[PDB]
Design a protein around this ligand. Structure first.
Ligand SMILES: Cc1cc2nc3c(=O)[nH]c(=O)nc-3n(C[C@H](O)[C@H](O)[C@H](O)COP(=O)(O)OP(=O)(O)OC[C@H]3O[C@@H](n4cnc5c(N)ncnc54)[C@H](O)[C@@H]3O)c2cc1C
Ligand SMILES: Cc1cc2nc3c(=O)[nH]c(=O)nc-3n(C[C@H](O)[C@H](O)[C@H](O)COP(=O)(O)OP(=O)(O)OC[C@H]3O[C@@H](n4cnc5c(N)ncnc54)[C@H](O)[C@@H]3O)c2cc1C
Ligand SMILES: [Br-]
Ligand SMILES: [Mg+2]
Ligand SMILES: [Mg+2]
Lengths: 486, 483
């Protein structure tokens, strides 16, 4: 019952910290989670949000969704088949996803049992005192104690949870959690929100919808995917539209009621109405701090609800650290992992290291997908006196043959024009998530635009566009966009 | 007619040099090629080998071939359709490819019309003298003169040509050139060679073959794709085999005759026989120097027939340069382009620059494909005292669901273990050619393994494997492999 490190949350960040502390530094580690395998009632489980109801299953379902486009696009290359026979069997997809996630859950179980001084505790972790974690049977602080864990160090890694807007009939709506377990693909679905989760699920539902189906995505402001490159936000909007998805911008649900046939009657703030079979709320995720009883040891939270941390993931309380989504910064699995690895290298390895939250490669598995690393130009333009934007945007030859002429591949490089330093790279198109990873390494190396254009292309690829851009398309000078420099 | 530059060969390297000299340096430029659009009789044409009978059409046809796998793989993700209705229509593929290539041909025609100081001449270019290119009706040097072009500077950029072994019945075989024009997909095809062209065409023919068809690839040596990472050579062999291609290693045709039905009867050196509809020779490509009459000016060739060049693409004759496949080095379109641009900057810009032929990213559009940049470990091990190999090799989760469980993604990083400098990166699997491009940029920046592993992954991707390898799988110490 005594440990060097107790981790509350067996997710992306918590398991990296846990495994590393045990296997690299022979430390004695307890990891707490509420559930050993995916799905209801608690959705996240051993492996965390990404494994159970996040990156892993989402990516398999987007891959499944992509076959709608491959089956159509095949015709341009001479593939012939009975188009009237094509069905998308959602139940098969969900059964395959469930088996894949369960196998990972079982993999993590094997990892704990195989590893000396790495112990999993089932139940709800909360802070009793500075050096004691209590595992209770439920999220109720008044529920039975399963365990009292003595901790030289405590890591909070409980991640996040979907935010459900407090509107009349929210109980008729789902989150991404339930989306992963729908018994039937909805004929009509409203995805609410403009972020990656709404966009990715709109794609998934669009491919698996039964005949006469309709996917509608609503967003409360003007243009989806705030924080992404603007050119790409506009293009993804057009390319989703081109594939049958209705993008309702400047619209937001005011209430939902059940129709007598069990469908949902959505009334928007605008007075507009829409009937759908499923309303999936994807308007935000919020850190899971409530259940940890942070009032008990005085761990400070932010004006947004995330655990306050310094660059070393340290809270205001010595021996207590927080990584990943609970910190409410970049909600990405590899960031959580990086932070956990750095924390353990610092505290147990005597090799202090701070996660770099700049120049983080990331993706949206939209159809087609986004890959991005570093600053968008509007952000660069406020930091740097002179910013250059290099842009290539055209439909690749193969999509002129596929018949998907709307699939413009977008490649943008944003530089500090004073020294050529690449500040950001923004891609839209097939392969963009794969292309961007080694761009992340390029930015860590402070690559300049001349490092890209002096590198020999791989031909033919989309990626070689990044090595073909010599001349800025336009600039920002003291924040002002202009075609040409003074 | 008088030019600052005459380019013989309107291909990858020739058009880059001609266009750069004309537009960046305001030079008067002539460019010669034997055909204005793709296909028989000369196959290459305005735009070069890559445009007409190479990278561009082959990539379209591999993309077409990939649908065989997509259609089958869709089932695991719940897609249903009538499998018995599926037909691969090769005629539609060839038509779509032909339109794509002709549109490029036409666009280059328009580039010459609209670029003042850049003039296209149709016919066969050869050297009359060290400042005169003669353009003739045919490759025969006795054929009619169409033009005589006075040149301050002459660029040889005629590319390469398929090598055909001198075996009995060679006339019953084709090369990649003719493969692009087969009116019907062969039921039985033997691709001869272990290089990328043989492997890429084996995958194309495997997808479009009619019912009950069979693709066989034969190679003289023990393991296809010499020059590539050895793990990847072994895995691509298994993955082709798993998709129904018969890999015949240690086998080479001795002769070909016609069966009474017009099919080809192949006899291998081993005595073994194989009946096929097409025999596609892809055993090599040789520099196209015969027709240039270089004996008129005394340009030095290698015994192979490549044009000898220094690092600045200069021949032994002042004012005569050679770039691209004619130099018989790295036969890649982007390298030819890089050499052309570096030559014109040097000669016309006085901006001295030579092409780095090291750490060139390249691809094989095998199914699944290869992306590679830099040294394989056996080469590194000879040049460096300690070499580390970081290796990740596993069937991605999506291929456990798709049912293609044979599709192992391989990611290998080779380092100078003394300082961690990345020497090579070798990938096999879906996306590899796209992943490897920015890896070329990393190697130009002398990236170390720590620069890869300290970069935060994009998840989930195949590419994040590159940023997840902290610990060598094994080493070479003074050339010897150590576990
Ligand atoms: C739909 C969706 C798609 C996503 N796609 C991607 C993507 O493609 N790429 C990407 O990088 N990121 C993606 N993310 C984000 C990614 O899932 C997170 O950033 C990551 O999982 C956060 O890791 P973490 O360690 O902070 O916590 P998590 O991985 O969320 O782990 C938290 C764990 O803590 C447990 N827990 C919580 N409270 C308690 C308690 N009191 N006691 C015990 N256990 C508790 C939970 O059961 C959970 O298992 C996605 C997220 C979602 C929801
Ligand atoms: C099947 C195949 C697939 C390939 N795939 C790829 C790939 O995916 N990626 C890649 O980078 N490379 C690829 N390559 C290689 C690429 O095609 C070559 O490296 C590149 O085209 C060579 O450029 P170049 O300038 O040397 O000559 P080329 O582009 O071959 O151009 C030479 C030109 O000279 C003309 N010519 C020849 N003799 C004369 C003469 N006497 N007078 C006038 N004109 C003449 C020809 O008609 C031709 O158009 C492939 C090659 C083949 C055959
Ligand atoms: Br061999
Ligand atoms: Mg254990
Ligand atoms: Mg002209």
């Amino acid at each position: 019952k005594a440990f060097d490190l107790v981790v509350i949350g067996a997710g992306s960040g918590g398991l990296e910290a846990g495994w590393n502390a045990a296997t690299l530094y022979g430390k004695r580690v307890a990891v707490v989670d509420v559930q050993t395998s995916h799905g209801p009632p608690f959705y996240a489980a051993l492996g965390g949000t990404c494994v159970n109801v996040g990156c892993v299953p989402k990516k398999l379902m987007v891959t499944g969704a992509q076959y709608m486009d491959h089956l159509r696009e095949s015709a341009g290359f001479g593939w012939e088949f009975d188009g009237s026979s094509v069905k998308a069997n959602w139940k098969k997809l969900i059964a395959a996803k469930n088996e894949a996630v369960l196998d990972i859950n079982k993999s993590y179980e094997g990892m704990f049992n195989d590893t000396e001084g790495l112990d999993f505790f089932l139940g709800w972790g909360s802070l009793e005192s500075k050096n004691v974690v209590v595992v209770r049977e439920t999220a109720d602080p008044k529920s039975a104690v399963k365990e009292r864990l003595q901790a030289d160090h405590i890591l909070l890694a409980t991640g996040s949870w979907p935010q459900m807007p407090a509107i009349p009939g929210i109980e008729h709506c789902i989150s991404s959690n339930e989306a992963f377990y729908l018994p039937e693909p909805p004929r009509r679905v409203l995805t609410v929100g403009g972020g990656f989760i709404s966009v990715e699920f709109a794609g998934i539902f669009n491919a698996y919808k039964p005949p006469g189906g309709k996917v509608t995505l609503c967003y409360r402001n003007n243009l989806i995917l705030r924080g992404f490159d603007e050119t790409i936000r506009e293009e993804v909007t057009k390319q989703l539209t081109a594939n049958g998805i209705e993008i309702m911008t400047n619209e937001n649900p005011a209430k939902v009621s059940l129709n007598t046939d069990g469908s949902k009657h959505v009334t928007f703030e605008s007075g507009k109405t829409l009937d759908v079979d499923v309303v999936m709320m994807a308007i935000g995720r919020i850190p899971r701090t409530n259940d940890l009883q942070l009032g008990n040891v005085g761990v400070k939270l932010t004006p947004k609800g995330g655990v306050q941390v310094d660059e070393f993931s340290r809270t205001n309380v010595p021996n207590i650290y927080a990584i990943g989504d609970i910190t409410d910064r970049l909600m990405l699995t590899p960031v959580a992992i990086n932070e956990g690895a750095a924390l353990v290298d610092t505290v147990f390895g005597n090799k202090p290291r701070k996660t770099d939250h700049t120049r983080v490669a990331s993706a949206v598995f939209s159809i087609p997908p986004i890959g991005t690393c570093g600053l968008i130009e509007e952000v660069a333009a406020k930091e740097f006196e002179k910013v250059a934007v290099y842009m290539s945007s055209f439909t690749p030859l193969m999509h002129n043959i596929s018949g998907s002429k709307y699939k413009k591949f977008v490649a943008k490089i944003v530089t500090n024009h004073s020294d050529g330093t690449v500040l950001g790279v923004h891609l839209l198109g097939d392969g963009a998530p794969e292309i961007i990873q080694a761009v992340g390494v390029c930015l860590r190396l402070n690559a300049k635009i001349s490092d890209f254009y002096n590198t020999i292309g791989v031909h033919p690829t989309s990626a070689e566009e990044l090595c073909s851009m010599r001349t800025p398309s336009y600039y920002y000078v003291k924040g002002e966009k202009m075609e040409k420099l003074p």
